[PDB]
Structure formats: structure tokens, C-alpha cells
A paper describes a structure:
Target-based azole resistance in Candida albicans involves overexpression of the ERG11 gene encoding lanosterol 14α-demethylase (LDM), and/or the presence of single or multiple mutations in this enzyme. The azole antifungals inhibit sterol 14α-demethylase (CYP51, SDM), thereby preventing biosynthesis of the essential and fungal specific sterol ergosterol, and resulting in the collateral synthesis of toxic sterols. We have used, as surrogates, structurally aligned mutations in recombinant hexahistidine-tagged full-length Saccharomyces cerevisiae LDM6×His (ScLDM6×His) to elucidate how differential susceptibility to azole drugs is conferred by LDM of the C. albicans Darlington strain. Phenotypes and high-resolution X-ray crystal structures were determined for the surrogate enzymes in complex with representative short-tailed (voriconazole) and long-tailed (itraconazole) triazoles.
Boat-shaped crystals of Ni-NTA affinity and size exclusion chromatography (SEC) purified ScLDM6×His Y140H in complex with VCZ formed after 15 days in 46% PEG, 0.5 M glycine pH 9.6. However, no active site water molecule was detected within 5 Å of VCZ in this 1.9 Å resolution structure, and the VCZ was displaced slightly towards H140 and helix I by <0.5 Å. Thus, there are no water-mediated hydrogen bond networks involving the tertiary alcohol of VCZ and Y140H and the heme ring D propionate, or between the 5-fluoropyrimidine ring and the main chain nitrogen of S382 and the main chain carbonyl of M509, as was found with the wild-type enzyme. The significantly different disposition of M509 between the wild-type and Y140H structures may be due to the absence of this water-mediated hydrogen bond network. There is also a significant impact on the disposition of Y126, which neighbors Y140/H, as the 5-fluoropyrimidine ring of VCZ was flipped 180 degrees between the wild-type and Y140H mutant structure. While the Y126 sidechain hydroxyl retained a hydrogen bond with the main chain amide of F384 in ScLDM6×His Y140H, a hydrogen bond with the heme ring D propionate was not formed. Due to the movement of VCZ towards helix I and the mutated histidine, the Y140H mutation ablates a key water-mediated hydrogen bond network involving the VCZ 5-fluoropyrimidine, the main chain amide of S382, and the main chain carbonyls of M509. While the ionic interactions of the heme with K151 and R385 were retained in ScLDM6×His Y140H, the loss of hydrogen bonds between Y140 and the heme ring C propionate, and between Y126 and the heme ring D propionate may be expected to affect the electronic status of the heme. This interpretation is consistent with the slight (1 nm) red shift from 417 nm to 418 nm in the main Soret peak of ScLDM6×His Y140H.
Residue numbers in the entry: 7 to 533
């Protein structure tokens, strides 16, 4: 008889419940910790799963090392396990596929296999608002990208360039950080100046003069508050009863209400032209099933596009200034190109002359190689996926992670990858280009293959549509900085390390450079 063993099981359960509170709590942490380690050992035997990085603290996983030094985390994992490995991250299992085969696996994954929106909806919907980007089916997103891409034409860039130039010169004249009419040298924190210059130039060109005008008021404080809600904490705490979350929600309503006010005003007066992205979305925002975007969804889409382009672009111009501050040779080279292309400054900068400035564009390209703003791109796995040429199966409910920025820093693909060298792009200054066949997901033909080791703008259905706007904006900014200023580091200082815990891989603050006017007697006119 072993029914006596079943009696003692019941007896033991009854004695378990009688344990004093110090031991029941002690067991409350001892039991999961022990079972978590037991489970990892058994998992390591599965031949149809990638290796899983070992971790001590249940639920948390490798969150700390990944959050603070992700590329160092990937490099060590890659040496132990190779290019495919999983790790636990705050309750999720992330499967990483490093290198160009991983770009192909994740960026070209089938629509039914993976979902970006299920990975990101909690990050962006609380900031942007409902009904756009990740708060909608993929076919809706594909068409929103088509709508936005319709204000981003060559002829739009031709009119944006003088407007962006005006904003940069205004900033040089009026900002406390410069005041070029009264100061000939000064010190700036580039993580103060670049977010400001970026919002001013992106507002004037994409949003128009009215929304730019609002940035000269206390309304600008709403942008700061909404900006602060764009943070990785939303992956864990998207809504908490705190002032941070309520200033964010207030800003989203106030800002989108301001966009809707302008929109309803324009169509009240039939004042709908071809000036900015607001006009474009007012004329071209009907989905292919006949449904029109509402004014709320148009406003939420403007917020999302401006907020993403704000963070990637401002981080990138910060890094450009920081790399050039220790490279007066590159500043000199760029300056000579400006004098040649613009006939000593007697030519006005135009979008077409921007295309004749290869070294300037290679500097943006090289900065995006060394500082990809988004160190990791996620998808949630919706159907079990077989990893080709392996026995691995990534089950549904995992997440896949692709990191083109990690491959950007591999000597195998970019010799001396940790050295900033714009000439590695000689005869190849295009922001990107399809090396062969093309495909259309809804917003234009893009490269069909995504195995290039350089992918600053991603690829596949979720590929960036802001690339040409970003180059135009960054090119005008840097053209004007180069012609107007020389700059260098305070003594002893150098390029700062990246801060990987924020939404983009921005420089660790404070990152100060000292500027000096090239022409101390140059005056910037206007009121
Ligand atoms: C240096 C500047 C930029 C970089 C490096 C960059 C990079 C990227 C990358 C890597 C993706 C792919 C995301 C993924 O696969 O999960 C992406 C998507 C996207 N980006 Fe950008 N971007 C930049 C600027 C901009 C600008 C200026 C805009 C808007 C004008 C913009 C709008 C978008 C949009 C709408 C998507 C589509 C997201 C999706 O389909 O899921 N980006 N970008
Ligand atoms: C989802 C978000 C993101 N994805 C991954 N890691 C960090 C991130 F912030 C992002 O891809 C960033 N981004 C890309 N180009 C500009 N911004 C994004 C895309 C479209 C958008 F309308 C707004 C937006 F924030
Ligand atoms: O001239 C083409 C124009 O297309 C419109 O839809 C956009 O609003 C403008 O940004 C662009 O300049």
C-alpha cells in the first residue's frame, strides 16, 4: 500500500500552511528562485530552441545588462552561443538573431509570423493617441506610411530647404546658446541645442508656420511634457497615477487639439494648399476600403511622426557635432566642399546643391553607422517560426530582436568599425539604395532583400519613410554649422559614450562643445 504516501502528502500540505510567517515568506522567494534555475537547466536540453542566456533573478532576466550595455551583451552572447540566442527580459523571452541573416529573418518575416504593433503598442499609443501607428492593423499602418510619404517628395524638399535654413539662422541669432550678432565664441551642451533646433526646423517645414509660431509661447512646455512620456518605462508602467503620466496625457490632448483646431479651421476656409504635412494629410488620408482618417487620428499621426523624427534626428545631429569637434580635418574638408559647391557662399543652398555635397552626406552616413539611434527592433512572434538551416523553432509568444546597429560596429563588415571615417563611403554617399529587386507593401517600392550589413533605416514592411527628410534636415543644418562655425572640445574632453537606457542611443550628458564664429563680423539680419 502506497495510499499512505497520499495521506502524508495531505499532512505535509497542512504542515506547510502552518509554517510561521518568516518561513512562508522565506519559501515565497526560495521556491520560485529554485524552480527558475531548475527550469533553465531542463530548457538547455531542448534541441529545437536557441540557447538561453542564464539568469538568476526570475522575471527580471538579463534586463540590467541588456538595458545598460546592449552591444556588449550581444558580443559576449555571440561568442558563447553564436548568432542566435534567447534571453529573458522583464517577463518576456527575446530571441536575438545577429548579423545580416538576422536582418533577413526579422525584417523580412511574414506578416502572419510576427507583429511589430503587438510589441510596441504599449510604448507609443499612450504618447501618440489612439487609432494610429501601433494602435491599428498593419494594413492601416501601411497606408498611413503612404499618406505621410506623400508630403515627402523631391519638390517638397525643394521648398523645405530654405525654410529649414531660415530656422537655423534664426536659432543662431536668437538662442541664448549662440547670439551670433553679439558673441563670437561660446560653449553649448549639444543635448540642449540639438533637440531645440530639431523641433524648430521640423515644425516649420512639416507642420507649417502656425505650429512653428506656437513654439514661441508657453505651448512649448506641452511638447516637453509629451516628450517626457516617450520613455522605455511604458513597457512596464504605461499608466500610473502620477504627475508624469498626467502631464503627458494632458499634453497629448492639448497638442492634438491644437492640430485639430488648425485642421478644422483650414477646411472651414477651404485654405488647403500644398505647404506642409497637414495640408497633405487633409487631402490624402482615405484608406483603400473608403474609410477616412478622423481629425483626431490625423493629429495623432502628426504627433507620432514628429516625435519619432524628433528623437532620431536630434540624436544624430548631436553625434555629428560631437565627432567633428575632435576632427578639425573633417571640418576643414567639409568647409572646402561648401566653398566649391556654393561658389564661395554666393550661391543659396538648395535641395539640388545638397545632392552635390557628397562629403557632407557621407558624414551623416558614417554617423548613422557608428550611432544607430535604435539599438534594438522588436517583433512579437505570432506563429511558430523555423529558423532556416537549423533545428530551432521560435514558438509563438516569444519576441524576436534584430540589431542592425550592432552589425554596423563589426570589423568583419566595416574595417576598423570603431573609427569614424567618412571616406569609407567614397563613391557611395547615398543614404541607402536597393541593391536589386524591389517590393511594395503599401507605401512605395523598397528593396526586397534586407541582408545589407548597413541598415540605418531598417527594411521590409516597417522600413523608415523619414530617411530623405532626415538627410535634407541634417544636411541643411550641418551645411550652415560648417559655413558659420568651427568648434572643438573643452580641454581633456572627448566623444562621450552612448546612453542606451533612453528611447534612442543619445550621447551621455553633459556633452559640451566650444564654438567660434568663422567670420566674427558676420551679422544675421531680420527682426
Ligand atoms: C536619422 C533619422 C532616422 C533613423 C535612423 C530612422 C530609423 C528607422 C528605423 C530603423 C525604422 C524601422 C523600425 C522597425 O523596423 O521596427 C524606422 C521606421 C519608421 N520611421 Fe524612421 N528613422 C529616422 C528618421 C525618421 C523621420 C524623420 C521620420 C518621419 C518624418 C521617421 C518615420 C518613421 C516611420 C513612419 C517608420 C515606420 C514604422 C513602422 O512601419 O513600423 N523616421 N525608422
Ligand atoms: C516605434 C519607435 C521605436 N521603435 C523601436 N525602438 C525605439 C523606438 F522609439 C519608432 O520606430 C522610432 N522611430 C523610427 N523613426 C523615427 N522614430 C517610431 C516609428 C514610427 C513613428 F511614427 C514613431 C516612432 F517613434
Ligand atoms: O508640391 C508637392 C506637395 O505635396 C503636398 O501634398 C505636400 O503637402 C507638400 O509638402 C508638397 O510640397
Amino acid at each position: 500500500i502506497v495510499g499512505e504516501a497520499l495521506e502524508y502528502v495531505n499532512i505535509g500540505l497542512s504542515h506547510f500552511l502552518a509554517l510561521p510567517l518568516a518561513q512562508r515568506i522565506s519559501l515565497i522567494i526560495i521556491i520560485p528562485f529554485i524552480y527558475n534555475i531548475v527550469w533553465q537547466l531542463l530548457y538547455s536540453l531542448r534541441k529545437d530552441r536557441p540557447p538561453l542566456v542564464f539568469y538568476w533573478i526570475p522575471w527580471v532576466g538579463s534586463a540590467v545588462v541588456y538595458g545598460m550595455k546592449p552591444y556588449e551583451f550581444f558580443e559576449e552572447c555571440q561568442k558563447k552561443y553564436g548568432d542566435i540566442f534567447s534571453f529573458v527580459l522583464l517577463g518576456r523571452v527575446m530571441t536575438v538573431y545577429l548579423g545580416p541573416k538576422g536582418h533577413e529573418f526579422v525584417f523580412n518575416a511574414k506578416l502572419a509570423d510576427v507583429s511589430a504593433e503587438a510589441a510596441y503598442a504599449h510604448l507609443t499609443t499612450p504618447v501618440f493617441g489612439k487609432g494610429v501607428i501601433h494602435d491599428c492593423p498593419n494594413s492601416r499602418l501601411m497606408e498611413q506610411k503612404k499618406f505621410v510619404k506623400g508630403a515627402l517628395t523631391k519638390e517638397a524638399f525643394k521648398s523645405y530647404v530654405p525654410l529649414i535654413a531660415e530656422e537655423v539662422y534664426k536659432y543662431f541669432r536668437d538662442s541664448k546658446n549662440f547670439r551670433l550678432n553679439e558673441r563670437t565664441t561660446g560653449t553649448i551642451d549639444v543635448m540642449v541645442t540639438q533637440p531645440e533646433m530639431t523641433i524648430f526646423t521640423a515644425s516649420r517645414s512639416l507642420l507649417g508656420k502656425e505650429m512653428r509660431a506656437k513654439l514661441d509661447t508657453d505651448f512649448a512646455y506641452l511638447y516637453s511634457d509629451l516628450d517626457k512620456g516617450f520613455t522605455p518605462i511604458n513597457f512596464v508602467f504605461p499608466n500610473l497615477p502620477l504627475e508624469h503620466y498626467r502631464k503627458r496625457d494632458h499634453a497629448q490632448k492639448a497638442i492634438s487639439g491644437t492640430y485639430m483646431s488648425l485642421i478644422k479651421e483650414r477646411r472651414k476656409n477651404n485654405d488647403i494648399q500644398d505647404r506642409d504635412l497637414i495640408d497633405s494629410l487633409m487631402k490624402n488620408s482615405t484608406y483603400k476600403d473608403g474609410v477616412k482618417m478622423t481629425d483626431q487620428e490625423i493629429a495623432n499621426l502628426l504627433i507620432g511622426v514628429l516625435m519619432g523624427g524628433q528623437h532620431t534626428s536630434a540624436a544624430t545631429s548631436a553625434w555629428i557635432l560631437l565627432h567633428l569637434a575632435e576632427r578639425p580635418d573633417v571640418q576643414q574638408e567639409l568647409y572646402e566642399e561648401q566653398m566649391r559647391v556654393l561658389d564661395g557662399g554666393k550661391k543659396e543652398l538648395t535641395y539640388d546643391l545638397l545632392q552635390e555635397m557628397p562629403l557632407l552626406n557621407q558624414t551623416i552616413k558614417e554617423t548613422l553607422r557608428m550611432h544607430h539611434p535604435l539599438h534594438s527592433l522588436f517583433r512579437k512572434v505570432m506563429k511558430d517560426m523555423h529558423v532556416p538551416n537549423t533545428s530551432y523553432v521560435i514558438p509563438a509568444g516569444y519576441h524576436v530582436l534584430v540589431s542592425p546597429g550592432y552589425t554596423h560596429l563589426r570589423d568583419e563588415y566595416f574595417p576598423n568599425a570603431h573609427q569614424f571615417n567618412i571616406h569609407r563611403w567614397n563613391n557611395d554617399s547615398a543614404s541607402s539604395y536597393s541593391v536589386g529587386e524591389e517590393v511594395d507593401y503599401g507605401f512605395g517600392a523598397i528593396s526586397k532583400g534586407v541582408s545589407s550589413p548597413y541598415l540605418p533605416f531598417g527594411g521590409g514592411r516597417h522600413r523608415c519613410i523619414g530617411e530623405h527628410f532626415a538627410y535634407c534636415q541634417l544636411g541643411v543644418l550641418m551645411s550652415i554649422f560648417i559655413r558659420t562655425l568651427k568648434w572643438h572640445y573643452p580641454e581633456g574632453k572627448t566623444v562621450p559614450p552612448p546612453d542606451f537606457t533612453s528611447m534612442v542611443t543619445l550621447p551621455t550628458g553633459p556633452a559640451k562643445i566650444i564654438w567660434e564664429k568663422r567670420n566674427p563680423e558676420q551679422k544675421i539680419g531680420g527682426r
